[PDB]
Amino acid sequence: MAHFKEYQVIGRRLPTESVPEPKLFRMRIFASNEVIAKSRYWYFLQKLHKVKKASGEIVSINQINEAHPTKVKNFGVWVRYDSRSGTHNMYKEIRDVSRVAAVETLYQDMAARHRARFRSIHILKVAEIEKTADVKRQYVKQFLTKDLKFPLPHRVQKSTKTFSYKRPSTFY
Template sequence: MKRGGNKKFRRASKSTAKEDDDEDEYRVVFHRKRKETYHQYQIVGRRVPTEQEPTPQVYRMKLWALDATRARSKFWYFLSRLRKVKKANGQIIACNEIFEKDDTTVKNYGVWIRYQSRVGFHNAYKEYRETTMNAAVDALYTEMASRHRVRSHALQIIKIAEVANEDVRRENTRQFLADDVSFPVVRKTLRHDSKSQKTTFKYQRPNFAIL
């Protein structure tokens, strides 16, 4: 066999191995991004004390981010535009994650947002039915990315609050507020008629049927 053939084979094998490595890296990154969820943080910061200003003004901000590092970055982003305080001449006093007491009850959440599209800046109001505010924010980012093609960095949450049933505005949310709301059962499990055959565990997979 000629040497040229061996070289071609070696080059092909190297390129194939490189493609496999890139594919594995893509799989890892994609799998990691699927698990990312937004968390609510409370960050307290101020300007670094000096002799001219020994007790500077303290600022507190609540925001949503994927982790504490990005939350602190958002804090400096907004504070530098609202006040003349930036990371170079400021300090963070506290950074705490906020958890909800009741995360098992479905509630109505109203979200006031401001986002940038291809045309310009827009204000909007969204409503979601979720168990926590973090889940509502996740649904917000998902909807804005799918329906309006809004990037996450171009969306700012102005306010989010729990909305009572009588104050709900959107018809899509109002349809779930009825006391007699019901949903069709599209998949039923066939049960045996005899009580002696109704056991918790079976040695074979049960049969399912769509009725």
């Protein structure tokens, strides 16, 4: 929906006379703001348990910041998405420095490659792959080789003026 934040959302399934202190279910929701986060919490909770926003209450909502936002991680991401003709689980791998950045990349990639909009995607799990050689996608593995270097051929410089007097070069 936007540049994502991650929230813990804890809801209650409001207490009654028979059942005081209900079971306090928690979810990790990727959303651009707390309103969407709570909406998503109620969506998934209605998918899982006999509850709705009218019969429950949000006990807490807290942004979870990346523990180490400046270290590059490999993430395994399990998603479930609706295609035009069915539902499918897929596992992908994303290299990024935070869970929110990885999830933004994942949503972009799903929309780009499967035309799956936000509404059609469920993030089943996002997990750091602690040990390389447990990374099982080539498009991520190729960036985990020793002494990785690569050039950037054909550099295109953006001109600030309409006309140039130089016939530019793409060297880099």
